[PDB]
Amino acid sequence: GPHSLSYFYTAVSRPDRGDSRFIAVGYVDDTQFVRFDNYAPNPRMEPRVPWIQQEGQEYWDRETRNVKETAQTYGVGLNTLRGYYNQSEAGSHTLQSMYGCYLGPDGLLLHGYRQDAYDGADYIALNEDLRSWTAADMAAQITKRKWEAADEAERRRSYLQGLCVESLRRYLEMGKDTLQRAEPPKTHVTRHPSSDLGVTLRCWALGFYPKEISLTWQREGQDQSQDMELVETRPSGDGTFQKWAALVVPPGEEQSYTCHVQHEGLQEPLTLRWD
């Protein structure tokens, strides 16, 4: 699929002394490359992968400035929405944002997004056309009228159409050897006879990138064996991810079940079994 550059912002209000904790992470697809935390002593934007350290100190100064100002803005937005929802100052509340841009075939913006949530549920999202807003509730309609009046949609559009895609191109060039190759999952099926007349088969896919993957089981019928103990996709810790799907089959019919794997690192769906 098309490459992506995105930014995730988490702002948490504190009851204790009126400020707010702001944490920002930056991703080039499924690889984190920057971070920021104003809990730190004299906070700065910090590198989190080797390649991004090819950027000079002017870049780091700028980024630091931009995220500090954004942090102040989210600090005031916390109070604003607290007023919108008629909530007191005793409790802690969260304001989250995720925005970003995908890189198109012509070298320009394929699509972009900017979504904001309050306390973990949709608040306001920028529509696909990048010229309108979808408000998730009544309080978000106030925000949306404010944003239509002063045309924040054009600011989001100017960012995602210029700065975002250009920076994403420069990044994909910088991290050429790691960001641009999708490594396929190394797959294998293990067997664990445990339950009475029941034997667990587990299909493992390890060490793949990007994170999206499909792991299903199949027996004599057509549907995915919903004899599926499927875990959430998890980071390996070195940039890749892993996953597995397990089920319990009678001791006799191990060869009647096949694990199907699908991942963009493979040109075709993979099929494997307990050998």
Partner: protein
């Protein structure tokens, strides 16, 4: 109040007496306040915590990872405490799950 899902696993297939990487991945929780510790036989290991991020559903995820060297005796687990859990959630490491 959304409860966290906790997975304890090695980066590579576990072999006795060989270096590997222990991971505790905690996902799907909200609010973001959480305590996550990796434990080798009940003692806190010195491990790194990832930077706070979240998924499309706005639920948060964190990764507490370190090095380890598994054998047949040492038990490994992950202790996670979140406002949604009455008692701490301890998930034991199993090389097969």
């Amino acid at each position: 109040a959304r409860p966290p899902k906790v997975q304890v696993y090695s980066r590579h297939p576990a072999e006795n007496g060989k270096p590997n990487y222990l991971n505790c991945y905690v996902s799907g929780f909200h609010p973001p306040q959480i305590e996550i510790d990796l434990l080798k036989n009940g003692e806190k290991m010195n491990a790194e915590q990832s930077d706070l991020s979240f998924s499309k559903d706005w639920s948060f995820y964190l990764l507490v990872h370190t090095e380890f060297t598994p054998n047949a005796v040492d038990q490994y687990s992950c202790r996670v405490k979140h406002v949604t859990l009455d008692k701490p959630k301890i998930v034991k490491w199993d090389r097969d799950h």
